Amino acid sequence: QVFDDKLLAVISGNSIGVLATIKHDGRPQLSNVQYHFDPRKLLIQVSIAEPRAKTRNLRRDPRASILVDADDGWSYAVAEGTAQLTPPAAAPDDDTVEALIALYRNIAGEHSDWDDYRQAMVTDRRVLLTLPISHVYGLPPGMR
Amino acid sequence: QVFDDKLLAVISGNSIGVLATIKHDGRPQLSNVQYHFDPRKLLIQVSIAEPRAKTRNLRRDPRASILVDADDGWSYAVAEGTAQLTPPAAAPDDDTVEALIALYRNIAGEHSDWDDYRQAMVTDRRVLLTLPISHVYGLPP
Numbered sequence: 001q002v003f004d005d006k007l008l009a010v011i012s013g014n015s016i017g018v019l020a021t022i023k024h025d026g027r028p029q030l031s032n033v034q035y036h037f038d039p040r041k042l043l044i045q046v047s048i049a050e051p052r053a054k055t056r057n058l059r060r061d062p063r064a065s066i067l068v069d070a071d072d073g074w075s076y077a078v079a080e081g082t083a084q085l086t087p088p089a090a091a092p093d094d095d096t097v098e099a100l101i102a103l104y105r106n107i108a109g110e111h112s113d114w115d116d117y118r119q120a121m122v123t124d125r126r127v128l129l130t131l132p133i134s135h136v137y138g139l140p141p142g143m144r
Numbered sequence: 145q146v147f148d149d150k151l152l153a154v155i156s157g158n159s160i161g162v163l164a165t166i167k168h169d170g171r172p173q174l175s176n177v178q179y180h181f182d183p184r185k186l187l188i189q190v191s192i193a194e195p196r197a198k199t200r201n202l203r204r205d206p207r208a209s210i211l212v213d214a215d216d217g218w219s220y221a222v223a224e225g226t227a228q229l230t231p232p233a234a235a236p237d238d239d240t241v242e243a244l245i246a247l248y249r250n251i252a253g254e255h256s257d258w259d260d261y262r263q264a265m266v267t268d269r270r271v272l273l274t275l276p277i278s279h280v281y282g283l284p285p
């Protein structure tokens with residue numbers, strides 16, 4: 001839809017969002033995440049680390065939402081989906097680290113020392129979060 | 145705690161945040177809200193409206209969290225609480241509308257036309273949401 005494309009435009013137009021996961025007690029857990037939006041596949045990809053609260057929540061209940069703010073700093077879009085998570089990075093060139101490399105390119109371009117990047121992924125036990133967008137809602141720029 | 149004050153400072157330093165309510169199916173519901181923060185009684189105040197999803201959710205389950213961004217746009221603080229809601233504004237002079245007028249003053253001072261403001265609150269079925277902060281976390285700048 002034109003709408004909603006106005007919401008996706010808010011998502012494709014930014015890189016920082018509020019990730020919302022579900023605590024064991026059922027209430028939301030919120031944090032900021034950097035992301036890359038794949039408009040062709042309608043995916044949102046995030047790099048997260050195994051021992052963080054957001055990761056543990058998602059392994060337990062894969063349902064995730066991301067709110068992205070528009071340029072006006074008023075309006076917003078929220079993407080919902082069911083997260084898919086890679087295993088944590090365990091070797092400097094396993095498929096997980098390879099995917100995180102591709103993610104960092106999409107977000108930040110060419111890395112200074114890729115080999116250190118590779119080692120940090122293993123060390124910090126990084127995970128690729130892939131979130132297929134199954135529903136969008138929000139208040140697109142242009143209305144009340 | 146030391147950590148605490150740095151987070152609470154983030155909340156004092158802003159007036160828009162992301163409000164998270166809980167949907168019927170257990171999923172968080174997210175939206176931007178404008179708020180006033182009382183650093184004394186440690187509570188957040190928000191003007192919402194009865195017809196909205198966020199309000200329906202909170203009347204079913206009063207747990208709320210609000211995330212607030214630091215100036216660097218990356219650091220942030222989250223406050224959790226159990227929401228307190230007034231009845232919806234029903235008459236231009238009732239207690240709810242008065243509370244919201246006090247809130248509007250705390251946020252943006254004096255309003256152009258209080259009489260149209262009063263009316264708009266009733267037409268909106270506006271609600272005053274009070275969130276005593278029961279817990280804070282996040283990543284201070």
Ligand code: NA
Pocket residue numbers: 051052053054
């Ligand atoms: Na953590």
